[PDB]
Amino acid sequence: ALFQPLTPGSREFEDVVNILHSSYLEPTSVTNFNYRRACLVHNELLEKEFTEKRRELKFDGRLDKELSESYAFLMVDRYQVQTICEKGLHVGQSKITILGSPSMGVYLSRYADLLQANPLDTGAMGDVVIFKIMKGKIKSIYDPMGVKSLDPTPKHECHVSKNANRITSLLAYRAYELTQYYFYEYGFDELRRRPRHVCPYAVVSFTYKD
């Protein structure tokens, strides 16, 4: 069973909602999102490869700090929750370029209230996939200023924007793109199309009221 529906008000339901509530860029976004349904994702194949990747990272010397699990988010269109939760998140599904080519990595939002470039419209409805991730050893990069962006940095698990903590407002210029995580993984001689240190964990449906 890939999806396990959770009953609203239950412990498991409020745990998933608590991941979202604790991950806002503006914690007062708690008044604007109503999470009306939620499922845990149980994809044994993806969880196997996440667990395998974590033990390889520890084999290659990453610190226990770098082995920690955290969460990141993706708002998903056209009822494609099914494909990402069953197949995993693949390269080429984002149009963001700020941290490297989307053909070489996958982009996830750091903040659960910052899921698209422009503000959400009142009454909007959406589906948000919650991924568990290992940021591992992070490569911090400056946003591009007339220079070609880097290929994914070998021996690091993701790219992040160097000064993203400067971002405090959902309306700051390019807040959405500057608060992304960029996950990638080199195979042997090729970039993997699906980084294994990203794994779908839960799905929620929301309505938005500003």
The C-alpha atoms of residue 205 and residue 2 are separated, in whole angstroms, by 16
CB neighbour list of residue 168: distance below 8 Å, 6 or more residues apart: 25
Position 201: which residue type? Answer: Y
CB neighbour list of residue 117: distance below 8 Å, 6 or more residues apart: 174, 176, 177
List the one residue out of 136, 186, 174, 178 whose CA is nearest residue 160.
178
Residue 14: φ, ψ to 5°: -75, -25
The C-alpha atoms of residue 171 and residue 186 are separated, in whole angstroms, by 35
First to last CA, the chain: 35
SS3 track for the chain: CCEEECCCCCHHHHHHHHHHHCCCCCHHHHHCEEEEEEEEECCHHHHHHHHHHHHHHHHCCCCHHHHCCEEEEEEECCCCHHHHHHHCCCCCCCCCCCCCCCCCCEEEECCCCCCCCCCCCCCCEEEEEEEEECCCCEEEECCCCCCCCCCCCCCCCEEEECCHHHCCCCCCCCHHHHCEEEECCECCCCECCCCCCEEEEEEEEEEECC
Are 42 and 2 contacting, i.e. CB atoms less than 8 angstroms apart? Answer: yes
Q: How far is CA 7 from the centre of its chain?
A: 24
The C-alpha atoms of residue 48 and residue 61 are separated, in whole angstroms, by 20
Q: What is the CA radius of gyration of the chain?
A: 17
The C-alpha atoms of residue 17 and residue 34 are separated, in whole angstroms, by 10
CA angle (10 as vertex; 133, 205 as ends), nearest 5: 55
Q: Which method, experimentally, gave rise to this model? A: X-ray
Structure tokens at 190: 């090729």
Position 143: which residue type? Answer: D
Are 198 and 181 contacting, i.e. CB atoms less than 8 angstroms apart? Answer: no
For the domain with range 3-208, which CATH number is right: 3.90.228.10, 3.30.1520.10, 3.90.1310.10, 1.25.40.80?
3.90.228.10
The C-alpha atoms of residue 25 and residue 69 are separated, in whole angstroms, by 19
Are 5 and 193 contacting, i.e. CB atoms less than 8 angstroms apart? Answer: no
Residue 85: φ, ψ to 5°: -70, -30
